[PDB]
Design an enzyme around this catalytic site. Structure first.
Site, short mmCIF file in Angstrom:
data_model
loop_
_atom_site.label_atom_id
_atom_site.label_comp_id
_atom_site.label_asym_id
_atom_site.label_seq_id
_atom_site.Cartn_x
_atom_site.Cartn_y
_atom_site.Cartn_z
N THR A 69 12.70 -2.67 -1.36
CA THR A 69 11.95 -2.92 -2.50
C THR A 69 12.41 -4.32 -3.36
O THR A 69 11.29 -5.08 -3.61
CB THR A 69 12.16 -1.94 -3.57
OG1 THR A 69 11.10 -2.08 -4.45
CG2 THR A 69 13.57 -1.62 -4.27
N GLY A 108 6.20 13.08 -6.86
CA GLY A 108 5.35 14.35 -6.65
C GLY A 108 4.40 14.24 -8.13
O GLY A 108 3.84 15.47 -8.37
N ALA A 109 4.64 13.56 -9.22
CA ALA A 109 4.10 13.52 -10.47
C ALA A 109 2.43 13.54 -10.06
O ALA A 109 1.72 14.26 -10.59
CB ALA A 109 4.13 12.43 -11.29
N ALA A 110 1.99 13.02 -9.06
CA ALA A 110 0.74 13.04 -8.58
C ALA A 110 -0.05 14.30 -8.38
O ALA A 110 -1.38 14.43 -8.25
CB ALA A 110 0.70 12.20 -7.32
N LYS A 161 -11.73 -0.02 -10.99
CA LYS A 161 -11.34 -0.23 -9.75
C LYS A 161 -12.59 -0.80 -8.91
O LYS A 161 -13.49 -0.25 -8.14
CB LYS A 161 -11.00 1.20 -8.87
CG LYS A 161 -10.72 0.99 -7.63
CD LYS A 161 -9.19 1.33 -7.42
CE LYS A 161 -9.11 1.25 -5.63
NZ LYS A 161 -7.53 1.63 -5.34
N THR A 175 0.89 -1.21 -0.02
CA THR A 175 0.03 -0.04 -0.17
C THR A 175 0.85 1.20 -0.07
O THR A 175 1.90 1.21 0.51
CB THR A 175 -0.88 -0.07 1.24
OG1 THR A 175 -1.80 1.04 1.16
CG2 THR A 175 -0.01 -0.07 2.56
N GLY A 176 0.38 2.24 -0.72
CA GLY A 176 1.12 3.36 -0.74
C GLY A 176 2.37 3.52 -1.77
O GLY A 176 3.28 4.27 -1.45
N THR A 234 -11.71 1.96 -0.63
CA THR A 234 -11.67 2.14 0.86
C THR A 234 -11.38 3.64 0.83
O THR A 234 -10.76 4.37 0.04
CB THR A 234 -10.82 0.99 1.55
OG1 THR A 234 -9.55 1.49 1.81
CG2 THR A 234 -11.38 -0.33 0.85
#
Ligand SMILES: O=C(O)C[C@@H]1CCC[C@H]1C(=O)c1ccccc1
Ligand SMILES: O=C(O)C[C@@H]1CCC[C@H]1C(=O)c1ccccc1
Lengths: 227, 226
Positions: free
Chosen positions: B146, B200-202, B38, B12-13, B42
């Protein structure tokens, strides 16, 4: 021989070292001779020494290392950055076999997660476990995401017929919350939870840590680890 | 039909949603029709809505979902807290096959990692990918740890004969740093890194995000998907 457990985890920073000590402390108070082995150790240039930390928390005197790398990276990377090599596979299996003896519980702490490369090419703690016939004790978090990591680690274990000795939640907050409480209940349905060590256990002094350690695990389960 | 791709992550994340959008944006810019499904969302009480993020970031309009739980938990936890079941296996699978059409890239975004429970009883994105013959795009981080999580996810994929379409690093730091630089080299030795999205693309607006996305993926690979 005796009993060998590899003490692995779903990742880095989950409490592998403190759990070794806690099980080591509990096994000694059960009268068991305990050796702890750390075949690959990185981050020495930052003062990381997990074996030494087990002795400090648990009073274990039978500590065996092998490989030591300065950078706090994956063993492959810490070695590549030092101009050094990874140990060989048989060097690790041998380090463990020399500690192994009847009546002795020999804990083998890995580096990071279960599938980290410990020896060239792509030899992992899972491979080490198959070679020395060890079971794997898996340290997990109570944090969001732990169920997936845990399930993945177990399936990687069953893929090479490496038995799972159970889970240990490395750090358990008091009081817990909805995510933690939920994850604990869910972890108990996937596998046996052997202990959930209270947060900050690494900061307990010798006597408190031994008390905590004895309370953490089922005495009968610890005793049942070695005939 | 067309191409169904599942977009999963090691946890997650890790940036699954922004990766979905970037691939959506890239593929649309290659003149491909995109749908994103999707099934379970949640965290809705705090305003989580990953289909909306994809619509906004990539301009996708075929956006399909089946269930929304307020709590910021794993779907089964969010369900338990709300007092209501998860969707059924058939609901997710038939929704996807109904989205699937020739010429369309259909992306399927899970919740959390690969083995998270998504439908009743204990059905995962991995099961879904088998049922619809989708390959898997794995979103990974560049942080210490990772490699293990990634190898764990690819072996879980392989164990059920689900192709790996590649890895995407959800967030690439600037400047990289020793650990992130070393992990990228290793990740590329374990599978094809398809893109690494700048951290930061988000937060970009849609114009810049499309530009980011076009340059993030290899144009020939994106096109070759459908
Ligand atoms: O034992 C740990 O997890 C703490 C080590 C502290 C520095 C590195 C970490 C480590 O052993 C490791 C191994 C492979 C991948 C990521 C981290
Ligand atoms: O997609 C994400 O990881 C963000 C979600 C934000 C709220 C929960 C998280 C989620 O989908 C999830 C699913 C299984 C285990 C842990 C978290």
């Amino acid at each position: 021989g005796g009993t060998i457990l590899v003490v692995t985890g779903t990742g880095t920073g989950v409490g592998k070292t403190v759990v070794c000590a806690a099980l080591a402390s509990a096994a000694r108070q059960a009268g068991i001779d305990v050796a702890v082995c750390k075949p690959v150790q990185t981050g020495t240039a930052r003062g990381d020494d997990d074996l030494a930390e087990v002795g400090r928390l648990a009073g274990v005197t039978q500590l065996a290392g092998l490989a030591r790398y300065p950078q706090p990276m994956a063993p492959a990377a810490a070695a590549e950055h030092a101009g050094m090599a990874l140990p060989a596979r048989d060097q690790i299996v041998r380090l463990i076999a020399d500690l192994d003896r009847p009546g002795r519980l020999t804990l083998v702490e890995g580096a990071g997660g279960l599938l980290v490369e410990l020896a060239e090419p792509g030899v992992t703690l899972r491979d080490v476990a198959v070679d020395v016939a060890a079971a794997a004790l898996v340290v997990v978090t109570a944090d969001l995401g732990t169920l997936n990591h845990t399930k993945l680690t177990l399936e990687a274990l069953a893929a090479q017929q490496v038995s799972c000795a159970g889970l240990v939640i490395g750090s358990w907050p008091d009081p817990p919350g909805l995510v933690a409480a939920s994850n604990r209940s869910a972890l108990a349905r996937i596998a046996m939870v052997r202990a959930a060590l209270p947060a900050g256990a690494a900061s307990l002094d010798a006597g408190d840590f031994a008390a905590m350690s004895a309370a953490a695990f089922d005495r009968n389960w610890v005793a049942g680890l070695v005939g």
